[PDB]
Design a protein around this ligand. Structure first.
Ligand SMILES: *[C@@H]1O[C@H](CO)[C@@H](O[C@@H]2O[C@H](CO)[C@@H](O[C@@H]3O[C@H](CO[C@H]4O[C@H](CO)[C@@H](O)[C@H](O[C@H]5O[C@H](CO)[C@@H](O)[C@H](O)[C@@H]5O[C@H]5O[C@H](CO)[C@@H](O)[C@H](O)[C@@H]5O)[C@@H]4O)[C@@H](O)[C@H](O)[C@@H]3O)[C@H](O)[C@H]2NC(C)=O)[C@H](O)[C@H]1NC(C)=O
Ligand SMILES: O=C1N=C(N2CCN(Cc3ccc(B(O)O)cc3)CC2)S/C1=C\c1ccc(Cl)c(Cl)c1
Ligand SMILES: *[C@@H]1O[C@H](CO)[C@@H](O[C@@H]2O[C@H](CO)[C@@H](O)[C@H](O)[C@H]2NC(C)=O)[C@H](O)[C@H]1NC(C)=O
Ligand SMILES: *[C@@H]1O[C@H](CO)[C@@H](O[C@@H]2O[C@H](CO)[C@@H](O)[C@H](O)[C@H]2NC(C)=O)[C@H](O)[C@H]1NC(C)=O
Ligand SMILES: [Ca+2]
Ligand SMILES: [K+]
Ligand code: NA
Ligand SMILES: [Zn+2]
Ligand SMILES: [Zn+2]
Length: 787
């Protein structure tokens, strides 16, 4: 209980940790009905508005006023933000020219540049194009500071998951806020936008920036503001806190606005009604920068201007209804709209039939505007499966559409797949620690927590950013990364066996009379991947490829090869169709066997280096080695053969050659991390040959396309995929057609970062290059989006 009778005199917005039964005066008290009775009279002054006027200049200080224009206000720290402009012939910050900030210019008593995070909700990246005509203060920050053309949010692209990802560096499946609404089957409790449950700390995982700061002795201003505190008051409060005594002043601050999200929902992102809220946000940035200038802090503080997600055109007329597909929608609960999550209405209802539901939702209308997925089948790049709050059945919804259970005040919405263009949002950093007038490539919001820790001198808690990948945003305070240590060194087996030693069931129609040589220099362009876990594997060399063959998983961990721009594609000769060859370098006991494949009526096999790309008819025989074989369902072979036979050469032709590394991934427990042996759950029939859940490929070339991939001087260009290894093509509605009509569409959906592959394989790539380690970390976080 809270003793309301207390008072907020000289307590306004205090940074005091104060609770039961004492009444509060802090920026969150209203949200807890815990404010002293006079909080609103003393702390939320509104009198005479937010701007000094010429008449008020040198007034007698009335403490009833929202802000002051009296002679004393400046050292007191509570001037209106335009005080000096109106009353002292100063210029607005926006009217001053940009000048480089080479070191911080902070008042005596400041030991580090403060960080202010200015977050804006639903700020679509493309709004920045409106430029200084609409948002001159923001445009100054953008042009003079360090800006990305956009920042990628996390999925789902809604507020709670994204704000908490920004604060923690974690994917939602890890921090726990997997939605704006969620059901937790263990709590048997429901988190809603509206209401009290969300205040319970049990929902919120990981460690947010303000906690990391506090635990390391850095004072944070309170990040959250009760919704009733107006933006102008939030700015005045931040400015007041910055004027505190050296022993009280915080080092990190956050401002938040619900705009332009609110207006985007009402009017849509391209509505003329959007100009006004963008102007209002810019005005707020203006007040902040004018205020900082009056305090002599505009060349001292680092400012981050960042959004949570964008906004798409979505209206009532574009709604799919589950009742058009399913007979009894009254028995399910749907988290609806721009994504779908389905569970039974009655928790654990034994009559719930998810396989039947998914069957009725799969490719049932030719224009269908969503696609069902069991969560383990969602693109791995979404990282959206490893949490009990994520329903098994998910609907990925097409941009511009809604999905609803059964049968207009809105024109915009968000929540869609985070690679969708309209979902991208904004990042600008301005201040002494950021670079001056620098554009940087788009990057993901999970990376910002490490950077904010760097800006504040903090050691980040374990998170999903790749620390160092954003060093190029910073003038100083960079993080020096260190290459992870190789755990398992390879073996280099020679010939140790005779064809006679092998009883595998393999046959091939293949003068009786494979050294390293230049294999590595040609086919392994960036060094051998390091194996970061304890295991046993062999380097195997060939004319056309090299591989790291695992003696434990009975297949290559990786297979590396380079295809020139001019390379020749050739067939598999009829007499070699079923050819599999024993590999005399590897024990028969560490080899697969063709009999398992014969016996398994559902499982077939494929190859990592494709016979289609062999350099000569004799080199082609290497491609049929048992050590180049992997288990593949026929459905998957449709994709894989098309990739191997058509696409790789297409990429080589377009990129002036390519280097490919391909391989298996085991993620049976869908946690985005390499499985240990115990976690593998499927084997080829009658064998101990494990079945990959996915196959990856990493395709690298020279960023300067005028240079061949094998003679590249400078930066690299990479695209990668993590393809789901599935027994059917139900995901691809057009799969009955020729592969030229559907395979590339599937691959684009399952694009991936090299970093994603590293997590899933326990491998570390690009260890031997001419680039810096920070540059390589940037490369490994790149996602080719195809938008
Ligand atoms: C993205 O980055 C994160 C952070 O590094 C990685 O997540 C970590 O994965 C490791 C390895 O699997 C886990 O280690 C296990 O730790 C547990 C003990 O964990 C408890 O203590 C830690 C430390 O305080 C705490 O962080 C954990 O928090 C989890 O559980 C809370 C209560 O249920 C929950 O509120 C919180 O949101 C978080 O849940 C998430 O993780 C759990 C697994 O622990 C998972 O079931 C759940 O669905 C969420 O995903 C927890 O209280 C030991 O017993 C084990 O032996 C093992 O050491 C870390 O716990 C985990 N950290 C976090 C914060 O999730 C991700 O792998 C990485 N993703 C990718 C793709 O690289
Ligand atoms: O002061 C704040 N108020 C917050 N709110 C309350 C209002 N609530 C309304 C709401 C709900 C959903 C959505 B979305 O899906 O577009 C937008 C607004 C949003 C969160 S968030 C917050 C500040 C804050 C600033 C920086 C960070 Cl990193 C964080 Cl985690 C929170
Ligand atoms: C809640 O707050 C009120 C108001 O401050 C408290 O009233 C004070 O109590 C003390 C001790 O009994 C009196 O001597 C003062 O005269 C009161 N102060 C004022 C300014 O009214 C009250 O005690 C608190 N109630 C609790 C803690 O349950
Ligand atoms: C899947 O869709 C089919 C319709 O295609 C549903 O089957 C109909 O529903 C009722 C009850 O089963 C029957 O009386 C009708 O004869 C069925 N129509 C047809 C054309 O078969 C089925 O119920 C749906 N399944 C789910 C789980 O929603
Ligand atoms: Ca796993
Ligand atoms: K078979
Ligand atoms: Na299909
Ligand atoms: Zn939002
Ligand atoms: Zn919204």
């Amino acid at each position: 209980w809270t003793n309301t009778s207390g008072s907020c005199k000289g307590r306004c917005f205090e940074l005091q940790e104060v609770g039961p039964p004492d009444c509060r005066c802090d920026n969150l008290c209203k949200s807890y009905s815990s404010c002293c009775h006079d909080f609103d009279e003393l702390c939320l002054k509104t009198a005479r508005g937010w701007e000094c006027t010429k008449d008020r200049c040198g007034e007698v200080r009335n403490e009833e006023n929202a802000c002051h224009c009296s002679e004393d206000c400046l050292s007191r720290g509570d001037c209106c933000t335009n005080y000096q402009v109106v009353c002292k012939g100063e210029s607005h910050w926006v009217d001053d020219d940009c000048e480089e900030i080479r070191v911080p210019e902070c008042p005596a008593g400041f030991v580090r540049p403060p960080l202010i995070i200015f977050s804006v909700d639903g700020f679509r990246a493309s709004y920045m194009k409106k430029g200084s005509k609409v948002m001159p203060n923001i445009e100054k920050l953008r042009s003079c500071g360090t800006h990305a053309p956009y920042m990628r949010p996390v999925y789902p692209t809604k507020t709670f998951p994204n704000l908490y990802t920004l604060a923690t560096g974690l994917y939602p499946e890890s921090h726990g806020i997997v939605g704006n609404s969620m059901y937790d089957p263990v709590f048997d409790a429901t988190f809603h936008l509206r209401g009290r449950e969300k205040f319970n700390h049990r929902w919120w995982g990981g460690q947010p920036l303000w906690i990391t700061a506090t635990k390391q002795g850095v004072r944070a201003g309170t990040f959250f503001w009760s919704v009733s505190i107006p933006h102008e008051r939030r700015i005045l409060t931040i400015l007041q806190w910055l004027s505190l005594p050296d022993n009280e002043r915080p080092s990190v601050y956050a401002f938040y606005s619900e705009q332009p999200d609110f207006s985007g929902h009402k009017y849509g992102p391209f509505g003329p009604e959007m100009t006004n809220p963008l102007r209002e946000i810019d005005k707020t940035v203006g007040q902040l920068m004018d205020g900082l200038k009056q305090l002599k802090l505009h060349r001292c503080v680092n400012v981050i201007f960042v959004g949570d997600h964008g906004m798409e055109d979505v209206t009532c007329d574009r709604t799919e209804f589950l009742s058009n597909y399913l007979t009894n929608v009254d028995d399910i609960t749907l988290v609806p709209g721009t994504l779908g999550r389905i569970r039974p209405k009655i928790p654990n209802n034994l009559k719930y039939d998810p396989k039947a539901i998914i069957a009725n939702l799969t490719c049932k209308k030719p224009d269908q505007h969503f696609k069902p997925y069991m969560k383990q089948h969602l693109p791995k790049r979404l990282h959206y499966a490893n949490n009990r709050r994520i329903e098994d059945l998910h609907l990925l919804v097409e941009r511009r559409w809604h999905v609803a259970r059964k049968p207009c005040f809105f024109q915009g919405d968000h929540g869609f797949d985070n690679k969708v263009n309209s979902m991208q949002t904004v990042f600008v950093g301005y201040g002494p620690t950021f670079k001056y007038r620098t554009k940087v490539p788009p990057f993901e919001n999970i990376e910002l927590y490490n950077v904010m820790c760097d800006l504040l001198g903090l050691k980040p808690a374990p998170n999903n950013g790749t620390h160092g990948s954003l060093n190029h945003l910073l003038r100083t305070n960079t993080f020096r990364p260190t290459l992870p240590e190789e755990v398992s060194r390879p073996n280099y087996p020679g010939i140790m066996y005779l064809q006679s030693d092998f009883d595998l069931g393999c046959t091939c129609d293949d003068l009786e009379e494979h050294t390293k040589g230049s294999t590595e220099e040609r086919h392994l362009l960036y060094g051998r991947p390091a194996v970061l876990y304890r295991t046993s594997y062999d380097i195997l060399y060939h004319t056309d490829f090299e591989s790291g063959y695992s003696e434990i998983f009975l297949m290559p961990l990786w297979t590396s090869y380079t295809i020139s721009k001019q390379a020749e594609v050739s067939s598999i000769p009829e007499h070699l169709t079923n050819c599999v060859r024993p590999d005399v370098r590897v024990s028969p006991g560490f080899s697969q066997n063709c009999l398992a494949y014969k016996n398994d009526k559902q499982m077939s096999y494929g190859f990592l280096f494709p016979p289609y790309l062999s350099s000569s008819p004799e080199a082609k025989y290497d491609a049929f080695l048992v050590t180049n074989m992997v288990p593949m369902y026929p459905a998957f072979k449709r994709v894989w053969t098309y990739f191997q036979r058509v696409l790789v050469k297409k990429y080589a032709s377009e990129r002036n050659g390519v280097n490919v590394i391909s391989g298996p991934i085991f993620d049976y427990n869908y946690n985005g991390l390499r499985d240990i042996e115990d976690e593998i759950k499927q084997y080829v029939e009658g064998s101990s040959i494990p079945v990959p859940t996915h196959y990856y490929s990493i395709i690298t070339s020279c960023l300067d396309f005028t240079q061949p991939a094998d003679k590249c001087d400078g930066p690299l260009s990479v695209s990668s995929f993590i393809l789901p290894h599935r027994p059917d093509n139900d995901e691809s509605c057009n799969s009955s057609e020729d592969e030229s009509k559907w395979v590339e569409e599937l691959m684009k959906m399952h694009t991936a970062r090299v970093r994603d592959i590293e997590h899933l394989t326990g491998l570390d790539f690009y260890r031997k290059t001419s680039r810096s380690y920070s540059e390589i970390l940037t490369l490994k976080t790149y996602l080719h989006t195809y938008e």
